[PDB]
């Protein structure tokens, strides 16, 4: 097979800046005819692959001139000059010269952005979940940047870090932010032995912890 | 315009058979060769082989000869992929792709989850409290997918569904919607969650607690 190794695996880049992504094949992908059926696809979260470049350097129809491709025989590069927020996605190279056709493991484009403090909300368990003997407390920390954010739950003043599940959205395509959910699930028994539940977020946009609570 | 629409998510037990349709519209089906490519969650894309829509002759890649059949219905502009004696390892999204000098049009995608684990309906919980953030917590379902919408989709803005996390055999996920304060509760906010594998759809209206 022709191994296709792709670098970088992640590529944070500023808006406006240039970006290159390279792919190396393990043997030449020049077809016996002399042509090189080499292509770049972008796939956005929740979307089918998008054809960017074919035959090493030809932009497909309606593709922005900021995208361009280069390389010969075993080494190729895609350049995005001026990264826009919309170029969020994962880029994959493909060779279609030798059967079987193989793809690169992909490169994730991450956009470095100006900073944004999260909007945080915490929710009590619902009566329906307490009637099932379970109490999950949920905290939302929506539309922030950077993605590095440390969240700590506290229960009557003391940290708890068992029964915590975090989930992160992909980076938003229009305004480039991340959002996150953090749930504390407690058994109802443990829930009714306590009074204050605190979701608190440490993020570089703040010098204070951002704290949200409620009391039973 | 040109579309390659695929059938929806299938949940299968190991040893079963699936057939995935690829219906092409907007172009003459017999003039472009069709590929089928597997995208494993995490591990990336493998090309499975192709079938010449003119000759009807199929080409399978070495690691897919055997249990995989590409077939055609050209009066219906549809390509089919059949996978027999389904192994666990076949859980992936499958794509049909039209190719000329490139894959310019890719099908919608069909996820197959092969699993001897039992389908379990969600418990969905309302998360009640300028702008107000409301939630729906969806807990303990298997398998994926689950679709969450807000007011049967007419409340698209301000919404976020976080990826499902697996813990136990089961999944959980949250969705949130931010609306104007002078709206909730005047103007009803309902969370709707359909889980195809258990044929269930639950609708939860967020009410002041």
């Amino acid at each position: 097979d022709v191994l296709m190794t792709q670098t970088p695996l992640s590529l944070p880049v500023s808006l406006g800046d240039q970006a290159s992504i390279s792919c190396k094949s393990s043997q030449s992908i020049v077809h016996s005819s002399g042509n090189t059926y080499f292509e770049w696809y972008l796939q956005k979260p929740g979307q089918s692959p998008k054809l960017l470049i074919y035959k090493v350097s030809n932009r497909f129809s309606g593709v922005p001139d900021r995208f361009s491709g280069s390389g010969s025989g075993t080494d190729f590069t895609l350049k995005i000059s001026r990264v826009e927020a919309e170029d969020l996605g994962v880029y994959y190279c493909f060779q279609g010269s030798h059967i079987p056709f193989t793809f690169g493991s992909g490169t994730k484009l991450e956009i470095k952005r100006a900073d944004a403090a999260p909007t945080v909300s915490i929710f009590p368990p619902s009566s329906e979940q307490l009637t099932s003997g379970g109490a999950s407390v949920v905290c939302f920390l929506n539309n922030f940047y950077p993605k590095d954010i440390n969240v700590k739950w506290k229960i009557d003043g003391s940290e708890r870090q068992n029964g915590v599940l975090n989930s992160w959205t992909d980076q938003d395509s229009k305004d480039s932010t991340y959002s996150m959910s953090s749930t504390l699930t407690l058994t109802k028994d443990e829930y009714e032995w306590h009074n204050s539940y605190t979701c608190e977020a440490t993020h570089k946009t703040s010098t204070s912890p951002i704290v949200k609570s409620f009391n039973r | 315009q040109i579309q390659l629409v695929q059938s929806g998510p299938e949940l299968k037990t190991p040893g079963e058979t699936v057939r995935i349709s690829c219906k092409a519209s907007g172009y003459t089906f017999t003039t472009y060769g069709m590929s089928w490519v597997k995208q494993t969650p995490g591990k990336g894309f493998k090309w499975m082989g192709w079938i010449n829509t003119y000759s009807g002759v199929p080409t399978y890649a070495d690691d897919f000869k055997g249990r995989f059949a590409f077939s055609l219905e050209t009066s219906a502009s549809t390509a089919y992929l059949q996978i027999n004696n389904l192994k666990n390892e076949d859980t992936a999204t499958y794509f049909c792709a039209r190719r000329s000098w490139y894959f310019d049009v890719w099908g919608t995608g069909t996820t197959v989850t092969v699993s001897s684990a039992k389908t379990t309906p969600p418990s969905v919980y309302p998360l009640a409290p300028s702008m107000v953030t409301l939630g729906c917590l969806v807990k303990g379902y298997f398998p994926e997918p689950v679709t969450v919408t807000w007011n049967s989709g007419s409340l698209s803005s301000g919404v976020h569904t976080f990826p499902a996390v697996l813990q136990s055999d089961l999944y959980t996920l949250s969705s949130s919607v931010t609306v104007p304060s002078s709206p909730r509760p005047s103007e009803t906010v309902t969370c709707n969650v359909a889980h195809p594998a258990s044929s269930t759809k639950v609708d939860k209206k967020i009410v002041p607690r």
Binding site: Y37 | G33, W50, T59, S100
Partner: peptide, 12 residues
């Protein structure tokens, strides 16, 4: 053109 029903020219 591998996998395709399309034609392409050779390259000397």
């Amino acid at each position: 053109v591998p996998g395709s029903q399309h034609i392409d020219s050779q390259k000397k």
